Known about the structure:
Organism (chains A, B): Bos taurus (Bovine)
Keywords (chains A, B): Allergen, Disulfide bond, Milk protein, Retinol-binding, Secreted, Signal, Transport
Largest sheet of chain A: 10 strands, antiparallel
Largest interface: A-B, 21 and 21 residues
Helix content of chain A: 10-25%
Strand content of chain A: 35-45%
Distance between the termini of chain A: 34 Å
CATH superfamily of chain A: Calycin beta-barrel core domain
Oligomer: homodimer
Strand order of the largest sheet of chain A: 1-3-4-5-6-7-8-9-2-10
Family (chains A, B): Belongs to the calycin superfamily. Lipocalin family.
Protein name (chains A, B): Beta-lactoglobulin
Subcellular location (chains A, B): Secreted
Amino acid sequence: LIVTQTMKGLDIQKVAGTWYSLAMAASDISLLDAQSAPLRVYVEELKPTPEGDLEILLQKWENDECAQKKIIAEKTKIPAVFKIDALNENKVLVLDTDYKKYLLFCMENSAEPEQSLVCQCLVRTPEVDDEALEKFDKALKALPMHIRLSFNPTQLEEQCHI
Amino acid sequence: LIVTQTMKGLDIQKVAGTWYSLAMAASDISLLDAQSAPLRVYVEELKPTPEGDLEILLQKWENDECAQKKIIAEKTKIPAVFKIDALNENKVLVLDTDYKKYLLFCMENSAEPEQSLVCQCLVRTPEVDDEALEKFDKALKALPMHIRLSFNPTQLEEQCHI
């Protein structure tokens, strides 16, 4: 409840498939800082289960290898908000998406709002879509982001973006 | 700052080596519930770096395998409290330890105290030490724990305790 953009009428069945983390932004430099930074994760695929949940397939630099992890986000009463389990009460929010080109989403710990916000711009193809980045930035001006990363085509095709 | 027991005069150099998670307890059943539960981790070795930090070598059921993870807890101004990095502002506290037999410690998210407290009883050998369990329970009565797990010798020698 910091993110004032929520998508009306989300059909998670339609966000299924292949995705590229084109841009990232966080409210804290230390969350996206290095490759081994805690929330520096790359989305590979979004898989919605028939129950209504959302299996997230991402990549992250855990050790000194591009490890593949599988997170599952359970649906809540609100169709655009999902829950990820732990000691950390993290919510996932879908801000906007046309299903065919991009998807904007943020993640925040319910307890530490300002200290856990991380948002990304996901695109279908490994191209630099300017229109998507505009919408991403627009949704971002209202939030306290302090670091913004952007990736190029070549990097998008590499595991963990090199 | 919920845990009223802190160890005076901790020498982390002396807690180096092999350890067994003999008992676990959390304030929430859902943290220790299943094998795949978020904070159901098993300690293998504690390795203090010369800088003063503490490399933690544990095991956890992440996928459907007993995966080995390596967490590093950075020292703080207080010699018995350490910090683990993420969106979650987790502190590690050493409550008591004789260095030779046991070590009692708890973990808590600074933001969500009551909702993240997890404590364990670590012992040097894969035996059931009654004296350790007494001290563990004593330190535990003052806290809001809602689940308490205890392991047997046979399980202590298995990866992920079976």
